[PDB]
Amino acid sequence: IVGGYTCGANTVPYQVSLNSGYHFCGGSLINSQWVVSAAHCYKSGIQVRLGEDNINVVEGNEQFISASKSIVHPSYNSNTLNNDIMLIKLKSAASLNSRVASISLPTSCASAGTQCLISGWGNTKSSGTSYPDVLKCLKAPILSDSSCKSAYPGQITSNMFCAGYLEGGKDSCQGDSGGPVVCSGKLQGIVSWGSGCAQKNKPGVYTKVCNYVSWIKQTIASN
Ligand SMILES: [Ca+2]
């Protein structure tokens, strides 16, 4: 996250870190046994880390649970990043409390102008590299589809939205991918892609979760 603020420990209780020896992507806890992330974060050998603030220090609220199954969306396209969404089943259910909690799926899609919260452990610089150890947060609005398509001609599908600031300076970045975009208490987006981070006229692009609720629910019900 570039241009954000330190969230505070366990203030984003649905945020997960995906770990394969190191943090590589975020995700969101949607019930006691399932996480949603970005398909481009797929790899074998995932450990899901819940209850994290500092990802390099054991602070006492963590739960570390291995994945038993990963399911990339049937229509994910790695070249265009269309349908950039993946479900991960945990080997055992997490223990839910005030510091480790699920986030609700949306019943309706959010409109442009709605303010959302984006969070992650990704790079905090638009030029160069500095990775934080504690969770960072950013408040940002959903942009109109017309502004999004004007920023990224030929690249925005109906399964994507832009959020952020056309002036630049505040955005998600590398290492935030897979993490949550929460608006009015519901999961509306997944951190997916952008051109650099925090550049003028290049806001972040997010997977539009409301288009996937039926797939999510049916997949969980049968796996
Ligand atoms: Ca920790």
- Reduce the secondary structure of the chain to three states and give it as a string: CECCEECCCCCCCCEEEEECCCEEEEEEEEECCEEEECHHHCCCCCEEEECCCCCCCCCCCCEEEEEEEEEECCCCECCCCECCCEEEEECCCCCCCCCCCCCECCCCCCCCCCEEEEEECCCCCCCCCCCCCCCEEEEEEECCHHHHHHHCCCCCCCCEEEECCCCCCCECCCCCCCCEEEECCEEEEEEEECCCCCECCECEEEEEHHHHHHHHHHHHHCC
Q: Is residue 3 domain-shared with residue 107, that is, in the same domain?
A: yes
Instruction: List active site positions.
Output: 40, 84, 177
Dig out the tokens for 37 from the structure: 């992330």
Residues 118 and 91 in one domain: no
Residues 80 and 177 in one domain: no
Residues 125 and 200 in one domain: yes
Task: Give the C-alpha distances (Å, rounded to integers) separating 21 from 18, 70, 138, 206.
Answer: 9, 18, 27, 26
Q: Output the known binding site for substrate.
A: 171-172, 174-175, 177
Q: Which two tokens stand for residue 156?
A: 């925005």
Same domain as 157, residue 114: yes
Query: For residue 204, what are the domain limits?
Result: 1-12+103-210
Q: What are phi and psi of 218, to 5 degrees?
A: -70, -35
- Give exposure, 174-210, as e/b (b: 16+ Cβ within 10 Å): ebbbbbbbbbeebbbbbbbbbeebbeeebbbbbbbbb
- CA-nearest of 48, 207, 206, 29 to 105 is 29
Q: Among residues 211, 112, 110, which one has the least CA distance to residue 166?
A: 112
Q: CA quadruple 144, 147, 151, 154: dihedral positive or negative? A: positive
> What six digits make up the tokens of 53?
């603030």
DSSP-assigned beta bridge partners for residue 104: 186
Please tell me the distance between residue 12's alpha carbon and the centre of ligand 1 in angstroms: 14
Q: Is the dihedral of CA 215, 181, 29, 197 positive or negative?
A: positive
CATH code of the domain containing 28: 2.40.10.10
- Cα–Cα dist 125/127, whole Å: 5
Q: Cβ distance 70 to 46 under 8 Å?
A: yes
Q: Same domain, yes or no, for 8 and 31?
A: no
* Same domain as 134, residue 66: no
**Cα(153)–Cα(148) distance, rounded to whole angstroms?**
8
- Separation of 57 CA from ligand 1 center, angstroms? 4
CB 182 within 8 A of CB 159: no
CA 83 to chain centre: 14
Cα-based angle 178, 92, 84 (whole degrees, multiple of 5): 20
Q: How remote is the CA of residue 63 from the centroid of ligand 1, in Å?
A: 9
User: CA-CA distance, 143 to 155, in Å (whole number)?
Assistant: 15
Name the nearest CA neighbour of 155 among 115, 128, 192, 180.
192
CB 190 within 8 A of CB 181: yes
- Binding-site positions read 52, 54, 57, 62, 171-172, 174-175, 177
Cα 60 to Cα 124: distance, rounded to the nearest angstrom: 26
CB 187 within 8 A of CB 105: yes
Number of domains comprising the chain: 2
Distance 74 CA to ligand 1 centre (A): 33
